[PDB]
């Protein structure tokens, strides 16, 4: 189930990060470090963490 | 000369990252094409990188 949609492009600098393009559907699984979300980019099939404010909740 | 202000709370997960509280004054030294910025946090005196969306120009 999709939980969020990316609002801004996020390109990893760190190997544990999830790349996001604008509009990407994301399933947010959990918060790791405060305001870091672990998610699944449903478009790319990748998993990783990203800064939480990059994603906006959607009904899915 | 402040260039930006932080608009989102950013807690570093990674060693190179700059912690941001909302409204922190920032001097952005490097905007990279991967949409990370490298800055001096003018409140905390720290330096590091943070995601471009988390700051706006003043």
From Swiss-Prot, chain A:
Expressed in which tissues: Expressed mainly in the brain and pancreas, including insulin-secreting cells. In the nervous system, more abundantly expressed in the cerebellum, pituitary gland, occipital lobe and the amygdala. Also expressed in fetal brain. Very low levels found in uterus, ovary, prostate, colon, testis, adrenal gland, thyroid gland and salivary gland.
Subcellular location: Cytoplasm
Protein name: C-Jun-amino-terminal kinase-interacting protein 2
Protein function: The JNK-interacting protein (JIP) group of scaffold proteins selectively mediates JNK signaling by aggregating specific components of the MAPK cascade to form a functional JNK signaling module. JIP2 inhibits IL1 beta-induced apoptosis in insulin-secreting cells. May function as a regulator of vesicle transport, through interactions with the JNK-signaling components and motor proteins.
Similarity-based family: Belongs to the JIP scaffold family.
Organism: Homo sapiens
Assembly and interaction partners: Forms homo- or heterooligomeric complexes. Binds specific components of the JNK signaling pathway namely JNK1, JNK2, JNK3, MAP2K7, MAP3K10, MAP3K11, MAP3K12 and MAPK13. Also binds the proline-rich domain-containing splice variant of apolipoprotein E receptor 2 (ApoER2). Binds the cytoplasmic tails of LRP1 and LRP2 (Megalin). Binds the TPR motif-containing C-terminal of kinesin light chain, Klc1, pre-assembled MAPK8IP1 scaffolding complexes are then transported as a cargo of kinesin, to the required subcellular location. Interacts with the cytoplasmic domain of APP. Interacts with DCLK2.
Domain SH3 positions: 1-60
Full-sequence portion shown in this chain: 606 to 665 of 824
Swiss-Prot record, chain B:
Compartments, record wording: Cytoplasm; Cytoplasm, Perinuclear region; Nucleus; Endoplasmic reticulum membrane
Tissue note: Highly expressed in brain. Expressed in neurons, localizing to neurite tips in differentiating cells. Also expressed in the pancreas, testis and prostate. Low levels in heart, ovary and small intestine. Decreased levels in pancreatic beta cells sensitize cells to IL-1-beta-induced apoptosis.
The SH3 domain, residue ranges: 1-58
Entry PTM: Phosphorylated by MAPK8, MAPK9 and MAPK10. Phosphorylated by isoform 1 and isoform 2 of VRK2. Hyperphosphorylated during mitosis following activation of stress-activated and MAP kinases. Ubiquitinated. Two preliminary events are required to prime for ubiquitination; phosphorylation and an increased in intracellular calcium concentration. Then, the calcium influx initiates ubiquitination and degradation by the ubiquitin-proteasome pathway.
Family as reported in the entry's similarity comment: Belongs to the JIP scaffold family.
Disease named in the record: Type 2 diabetes mellitus: A multifactorial disorder of glucose homeostasis caused by a lack of sensitivity to insulin. Affected individuals usually have an obese body habitus and manifestations of a metabolic syndrome characterized by diabetes, insulin resistance, hypertension and hypertriglyceridemia. The disease results in long-term complications that affect the eyes, kidneys, nerves, and blood vessels.
Miscellaneous notes: A chemically synthesized cell-permeable peptide of the minimal inhibitory domain decreases brain lesions in both transient and permanent ischemia. The level of protection is still high when administered 6 or 12 hours after ischemia.
Protein function: The JNK-interacting protein (JIP) group of scaffold proteins selectively mediates JNK signaling by aggregating specific components of the MAPK cascade to form a functional JNK signaling module. Required for JNK activation in response to excitotoxic stress. Cytoplasmic MAPK8IP1 causes inhibition of JNK-regulated activity by retaining JNK in the cytoplasm and inhibiting JNK phosphorylation of c-Jun. May also participate in ApoER2-specific reelin signaling. Directly, or indirectly, regulates GLUT2 gene expression and beta-cell function.
Notes concerning its domains: The destruction boxes (D-box) may act as recognition signals for degradation via the ubiquitin-proteasome pathway.
Record-given protein name: C-Jun-amino-terminal kinase-interacting protein 1
Gene designation per UniProt: MAPK8IP1
Portion of the full sequence shown: 490 to 547 of 711
